[PDB]
Amino acid sequence: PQKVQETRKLVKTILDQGHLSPFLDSLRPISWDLDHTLTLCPIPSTMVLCDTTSAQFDLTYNGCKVINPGSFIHNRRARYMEYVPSSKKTIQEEIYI
Amino acid sequence: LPPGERREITLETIGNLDLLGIHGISNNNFIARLDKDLKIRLHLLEKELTDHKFVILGANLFLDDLKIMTALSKILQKLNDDPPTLLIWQGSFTSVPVFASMSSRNISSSTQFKN
Amino acid sequence: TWEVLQYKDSGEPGVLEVFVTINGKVQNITFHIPKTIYMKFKSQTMPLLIEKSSASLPNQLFKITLPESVFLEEKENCTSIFNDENVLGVFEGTITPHQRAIMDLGASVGFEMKDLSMGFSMDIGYLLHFPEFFSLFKSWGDTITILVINASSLGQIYKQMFEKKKGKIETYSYLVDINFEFVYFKLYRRLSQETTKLKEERGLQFLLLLQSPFITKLLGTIRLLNQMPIVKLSTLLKKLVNHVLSSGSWISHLIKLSQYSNIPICNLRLDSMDYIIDVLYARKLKKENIVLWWNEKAPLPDHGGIQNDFDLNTSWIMNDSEFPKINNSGVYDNVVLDVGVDNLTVNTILTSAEFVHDAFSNDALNVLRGMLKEWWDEALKENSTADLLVNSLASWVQNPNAKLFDGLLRYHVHNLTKKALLQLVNEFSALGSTIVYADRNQILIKTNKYSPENCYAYSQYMMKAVRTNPMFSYLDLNIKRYWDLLIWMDKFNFSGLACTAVSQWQLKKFLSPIYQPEFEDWMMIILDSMLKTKQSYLKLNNSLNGFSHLFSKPLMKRVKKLFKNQQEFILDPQYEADYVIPVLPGSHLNVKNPLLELVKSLCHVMLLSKSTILEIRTLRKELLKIFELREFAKVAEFKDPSLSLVVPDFLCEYCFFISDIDFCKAAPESIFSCVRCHKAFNQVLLQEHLIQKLRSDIESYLIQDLRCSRCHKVKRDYMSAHCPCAGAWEGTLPRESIVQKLNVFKQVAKYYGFDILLSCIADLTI
Ligand SMILES: [Zn+2]
Ligand SMILES: [Zn+2]
């Protein structure tokens, strides 16, 4: 499905690129001293890669579990997400409103 | 795109540094090391704590919309029955960006954010 | 139905509840409106209402039209045309339905909007609230409810103010008419309950006037029954009585605004004329087939998704504002014309007149020009509303809260204003004069003439000769002062005789308290000597030659005596407070000898005299000999004791006056109140502008280009270690300059006690 493919593409881009801001500094400026924080070089164990313009997901790639609770209020539901560190499950949750 | 590298492979081939201070702080004469036995002990404790849960709220949680606040009141009322270990709030806590006001009649942008 | 009083959105999408007027009654009614959308593609697709279209974009296009329900249910859910598939972005998708209604229907218009197309005399209610002090009034009741001496003082204050405002009350009596009783205070339930009592006694046929500047507006609409038609508005009971009796004038003014602009009475805001300009510009833009960059949700223009991304041009456009203000310091024995200027921005927009990628759209500019000409002609025909509008344009072109705000438009207007000021200086100088100083509000002009009484004719000729050039047809050129003799180094540091003598010196403020009177004394003596010399030379017929000789020897004798006294008393606790140097905003530097600081100041003021450099210089030598300092010693050199911190283009909304304000070189009264009018600036607004300036400069540091340190080429690549000419890369904003800027910010924050700015400064480091 389109929604799956355009998020596999996202996390594969981010983690293969190894760095949270692949874009040129003339398109997303970085504080030069602090660019080391955006680098992911030992790939994190989990990533809450939050994004309001993509579907929710809880993918895994290279052992990195990347989750996105994309937006709090969407399609007349409140949306929130329960990551469980001692098992790495990711139970999505919603309240209708 | 150049192939990503699994966490273990990266850590073992850079020399297993503590790049966080999870085990110890570094100095210019002393790079902190991510001690294997302590790593294992922590990992076993991590698997032991079945009950810990991190709750992540969605983005664009505008505090200045009553519908957001109503929804959120319901959610937090659920969470008070069984508290998270940790609770990530995030992302743009106001509907408009909060910038230098152009007028003094309305309550100013900064003051509104504080409210 | 064929007249409107209010639009508001229904809960459900695309539907409006509307309050309409016909046959002498208000009626509640409801419309259905489709959402118009524009989309752009590089390649064709048409799966399906959708119409291929043509319209100028903001700096393959299809119009799209749906009821908002089907658009909403499709867009957020399906694999539809609204999702991916070579869209370059939706353009007008942010416009709220009732904000489409106000544009296309207005006041002079369920029911399909498909077939809708392009004398007040009723009751009023009132609910103004002053935070706990909820105030309620009607045009159909003889008592007033004012919540938590009271009644007695109310009665006589009403009587006095009613007597003060009789004619204004009488002429607007037919809109709102008079004495009444009083009452005063879980309590908050009375607000909902007695508003039900209002609704029970007037189901329709009355109009509710909401609130005043100490707002809590949204929570107010939670207390208030949300189904009324509502005119939203944003021992001190004198204020409340005054507002109540002012109501009739507000209704008259709002009727004038509505009948002029075709905006319903509830929807237009008195609090911002910029909004009326937004809707009225949106009409003429869509009528000239421009895709509209209205943005409801955020200040930035809705160019589609592109508006969310950082851009070096965009960030330059937002960060930049400084006029290249001219300041030719000197002494002037010729009469100097202190020319005020106003309506400069309006003049540029009227008199103004892809390859350029930060020029505002020339189509939209042409619309703004012709529309401004229309408003201006109606102001010349004494339309109070059109006059107020043209005055308020200077706010709207800058205000980010304008619905049609665009940084490109702000910048286009701004740099045209800059060019126009330079051309105005060119015009005055082309007529044989010479400019002392110039900025966007003021010009000081050397005349090549010597007598004010001789020149009250020629000055008016000169100013007329400027305004009669078409480039300056609309300028408020105004000869605000005549300077007979002028000493000038900047607008915060001057003295002169006006046609009589005034002196003001930020220089003076840095001298220790014993010497500030001494400075003013010798400045009066300098003016007196210069004037004696001018009038002497003119009786005998650059005229200042020899003015030092009338006072040099007294000044040296005085300075010698003061130097002896300083050696006696600078260390003395009896006197040291008069020798302590003041800490101040922009306090530039440490100083070891305060008398030497006075001498440096006097000598610098006198060294402004280009005609007479030699005699002053020799006197300066003979003065510094008292300290045994050599004539050119680095200590004896005068560096300005003040560091400027200019917040560019501050707006006084009370008189729509745009001014750069310098928190260090300006006196405190000019910081906390306007110079032209004298309304006070709000403290938090002021601090917010300082934090905006601070963060703008930090960002300008981090987004800078690097320049080669020995050949000044720009660094074009991303990963070179040095320029190909072997020069090391360096900043175009060196780090030292930004350290200095943060230092003056911390000084200003400490001195004026700007708690928000000071905590921002704290949060940088910590
Ligand atoms: Zn003012
Ligand atoms: Zn070079």
DSSP string of chain B? Answer: -PPP--HHHHHHHHT-B-SSSSS---BTTB--B--HHHHHHHHHHHHH-TT--EEEEPS---TT-HHHHHHHHHHHHHHTTS--SEEE--S-SSSS-----S-SSSPPHHHHHH-
Quick check: C650 and C660 in contact, CB under 8 A? Answer: yes
- Residue C361 gets which letter from DSSP? P
Tokens found for residue C525: 């003596």
Residues of chain A found within 8 Å of residue B61, distances taken between Cβ atoms: 72
- Cα–Cα distances (Å) from C351 to C284, C343, C469, C473, in that order, read 20, 12, 11, 8
The answer to whether A31 contacts C702, with C-beta atoms less than 8 Å apart, is yes
Which residues are CB-contacts of C374 (< 8 A; sequence separation ≥ 6)?
Answer: none
Neighboring chains of B (3 or more beta-carbon pairs < 8 A)? A, C
What is the C385 CA–ligand 1 centroid distance (Å)? Answer: 20
Angle between helices C312-319 and C683-702 (to 10 degrees): 140
Whole-number Å distance between alpha carbons of A52 and C140: 52
d(CA C485, CA B72): 70
The pairs formed by C708-712 with CB atoms below 8 angstroms and a separation of 24 or more are none
Q: Which ligand is nearest to the CA of C678?
A: 1
Give the closest of C77, C84, C312 to A26, CB-based.
C312
Partners of C311 on chain A (C-beta within 8 Å) are 27
Cβ-based burial of C462 (10 A; exposed 0-12, middle 13-18, buried ≥19): buried
Of C697, C672, C685, nearest in space to C761 by CA: C697
C735, burial (CB in 10 Å: exposed 0-12, middle 13-18, buried 19+) = exposed
Among B8, B13, B9, B4, CA closest to A15: B4
Written as one letter, the residue type at C7 is: Y
Neighbours of chain C (3+ CB pairs under 8 A): A, B
Torsion on CA atoms C509, C511, C517, C520, rounded to nearest 10: -70
CB B110 within 8 A of CB C756: yes
| B1: chain A residues, CB-CB within 8 Å | 12-13, 16-17
C266 in a labelled binding site: no
One DSSP character per residue, C406-421 reads: -HHHHHHHHHHHHHHH
Please tell me which residue of chain A has the smallest CA distance to C72. Answer: A75
Chain A: touching chains (3 or more CB pairs < 8 Å): B, C
Give the other-Cβ count within 10 Å of C461's Cβ.
11
**Single-letter residue type at C158:** Y
User: In whole angstroms, what is the distance from residue C66 CA to residue C62 CA?
Assistant: 13
Q: Are strands C111-112 and C123-126 parallel, antiparallel or unpaired?
A: unpaired
In chain A, residues preceding a discontinuity (C to N beyond 2.5 A) are none
CB-based burial label for C571 (10 Å; 0-12, 13-18, 19+): exposed
| C711 annotated as ligand-binding | yes
Subunit contact A43:B50, Cβ cutoff 8 A: no
Cα–Cα distances in angstroms (integers) from residue C721 to residues A24, C708, C711, C713, C735, in the given order: 17, 11, 15, 14, 19
**Which residues lie closer than 8 Å to C248 by C-beta, 6 or more apart?**
C168, C169, C171, C172, C173, C175, C176
| Distant-in-sequence, close-in-space partners of C575: CB < 8 Å, separation ≥ 6 | C514, C569
Three-state DSSP string of C568-604: HHCCCCCCHHHHCCCCCCCECCCCCCHHHHHHHHHHH
Sign of the Cα torsion C522, C523, C526, C531 reads negative
Residue C310 to residue A74, Cβ atoms within 8 A: no
Q: How far is C127 from chain B (nearest CA, A)?
A: 17
Q: Which amino acid is at A55?
A: A
Beta bridge pairs of residue A79: A94
Is B107 at the interface with chain C, CB within 8 A?
Answer: yes
Half-sphere exposure (Cβ direction) of C254: Cα atoms closer than 13 Å: 24
> Across the interface, do B46 and A85 touch by the CB < 8 Å criterion?
yes
SS3 assignment, position C748 = helix
Q: Residue C490: CA atoms inside 13 Å, Cβ hemisphere, count?
A: 12
Count the Cβ atoms, other than its own, within 10 Å of residue C360: 21
Burial class (CB in 10 A: 0-12, 13-18, 19+), C167: exposed
Pairing of β C143-146 and β C181-183: parallel
What is the rounded distance in angstroms from the CA atom of residue B56 to the CA atom of residue C101?
Answer: 40
Q: Name the experiment that determined this structure.
A: cryo-EM
Q: Do B48 and A86 touch (CB under 8 A)?
A: yes
Between the CA atoms of C237, C239, C240 and C245, what dihedral angle is there, to the nearest 10 degrees?
130
Collect all residues with Cβ–Cβ distance below 8 Å to C226 and sequence separation of at least 6.
none
Closest-approach residue (CA) in chain B for C684? B108
- Resolution of the coordinates in A? 3.2
List the Cα angle C440/C442/C446 in 5-degree steps: 130
C51 CB burial (10 A radius; 0-12, 13-18, 19+): exposed
Mutate to test the interface with A, among C702, C703, C717, C764 (most CBs of A within 10 A): C702
Cα of C377 from ligand 1 centre, angstroms: 25
Question: What does the alpha-carbon distance between residue C746 and residue C749 come to, in Å, rounded to a whole number?
Answer: 5
Residue C158 forms contact with B (CB below 8 Å): no
**Which-ligand-closest: CA of C713?**
2
| Cβ atoms C742, C696 nearer than 8 A | no
Ligand nearest to the CA of C677: 1
SS (H, E, C) C197-226: HHHHHCCCCEEEECCCCCCCHHHHHHHCCC
Which helix (H) or strand (E) is C133 found in, with range?
Answer: strand C133-138
Contact C344, C417 (CB under 8 A): yes
Closest alpha carbon to C299 in B65, B107, B94: B94
Task: Give kind and range of the element (H or E) at residue C130.
Answer: strand C129-130
